[PDB]
Amino acid sequence: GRKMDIVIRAAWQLFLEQGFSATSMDAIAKAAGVSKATLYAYFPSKEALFASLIVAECESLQRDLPVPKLSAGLSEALRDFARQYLHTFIHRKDVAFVRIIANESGRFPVLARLFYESGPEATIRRLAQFLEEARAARVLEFDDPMEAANQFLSLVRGELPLLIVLGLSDLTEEAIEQEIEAGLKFFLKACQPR
Amino acid sequence: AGRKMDIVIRAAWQLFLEQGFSATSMDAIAKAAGVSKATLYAYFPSKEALFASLIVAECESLQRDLPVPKLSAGLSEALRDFARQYLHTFIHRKDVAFVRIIANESGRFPVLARLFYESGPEATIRRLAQFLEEARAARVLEFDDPMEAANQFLSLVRGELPLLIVLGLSDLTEEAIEQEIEAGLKFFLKACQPR
Numbered sequence A: 001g002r003k004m005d006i007v008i009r010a011a012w013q014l015f016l017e018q019g020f021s022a023t024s025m026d027a028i029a030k031a032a033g034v035s036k037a038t039l040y041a042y043f044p045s046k047e048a049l050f051a052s053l054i055v056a057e058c059e060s061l062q063r064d065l066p067v068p069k070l071s072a073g074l075s076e077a078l079r080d081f082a083r084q085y086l087h088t089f090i091h092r093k094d095v096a097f098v099r100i101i102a103n104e105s106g107r108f109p110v111l112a113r114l115f116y117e118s119g120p121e122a123t124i125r126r127l128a129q130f131l132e133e134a135r136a137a138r139v140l141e142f143d144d145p146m147e148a149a150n151q152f153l154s155l156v157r158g159e160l161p162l163l164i165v166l167g168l169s170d171l172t173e174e175a176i177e178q179e180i181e182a183g184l185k186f187f188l189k190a191c192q193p194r
Numbered sequence B: 001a002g003r004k005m006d007i008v009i010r011a012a013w014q015l016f017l018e019q020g021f022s023a024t025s026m027d028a029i030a031k032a033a034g035v036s037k038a039t040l041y042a043y044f045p046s047k048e049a050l051f052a053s054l055i056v057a058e059c060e061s062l063q064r065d066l067p068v069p070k071l072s073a074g075l076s077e078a079l080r081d082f083a084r085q086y087l088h089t090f091i092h093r094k095d096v097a098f099v100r101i102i103a104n105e106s107g108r109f110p111v112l113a114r115l116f117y118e119s120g121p122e123a124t125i126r127r128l129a130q131f132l133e134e135a136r137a138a139r140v141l142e143f144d145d146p147m148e149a150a151n152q153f154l155s156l157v158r159g160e161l162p163l164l165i166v167l168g169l170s171d172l173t174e175e176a177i178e179q180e181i182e183a184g185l186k187f188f189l190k191a192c193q194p195r
Ligand SMILES: O=c1c(-c2ccc(O)cc2)coc2cc(O)cc(O)c12
Pocket: A094, A095, A098, A120, A159, A161, A162, B159, B160, B162, B163, B166
């Protein structure tokens, strides 16, 4: 129903205000204006609710990432993928999610891994498949595509998660282009043949 | 002595991590340390100043656990050693309480947040950068800016681990750490070694 989404938005609000364990299914029901019966019918448990929230946001973020195409040019394809990757830190729920899960002090490993595999690791895999294509075409060289994808993302991302968390990141579109161009230049120094 | 300053420091640290920075008052700190407000405010003009001392102290300390890398040891071994000590910090979560305390302020204390950044993380970059200048001067690496290069080295080696640790999905044997480092270094050198 339309209640499912109202519940979702109400739960998100509380998880972010208070944390996951500090939010009760009781509080969620009240904030969404439904009976516990209704709530538990749509979601078997708090853990199931948060899982839905995770998969939904992560599938969403993933379709805002381009599928990079070699036909667009090696540099432009990476540059574009990088640009979308960084816009998603700054303007999406990834840091929030990590904050919420980290605050659980390791007591929900299944959710923690679900987030990891649905978001960050998924991003790595998509990029990796592009990097396989580039290696097959002899325009990059490296031993493992996932390792290389992760290196590219580490370079481009750099230090920003920390800066964001400290509340010091203020990134104009121009400052982002510079971040990307530095990371890419380096990535290509290491992986382009000569 | 008037080392009381240290008792106050430890008492404030305790409260900041129990309750948060804003939730802790100079009044509570005085009581927990067993001094008058007069004594307290004589040593520290404000709560912000007290936290700044804590920050500078903990950051200087973490910095001494890092080696000063030496070209005589070999380029690779020197970096490898620096990397190893750098990751130790993350793995044993030596930064985490501080970051928690600052992050939980939701950006209301930007001067302290920057003080932490410049005393810790940025300091690490600067140390490495000075080593990389020497390596460049010795013609064994090439790159345009030493801070940029230092930051790139550290981003490579660090990669994804901070995230994994925070999520509670990392358990890193010594061997797994060597592999993390070797991967980051191999790459760093592919990009910066001549030929
Ligand atoms: O690396 C991080 C960190 C982290 C924490 C401390 C650091 O010094 C660097 C990164 C925090 O949240 C994330 C969140 C992410 O989605 C991906 C990441 O790679 C990270």
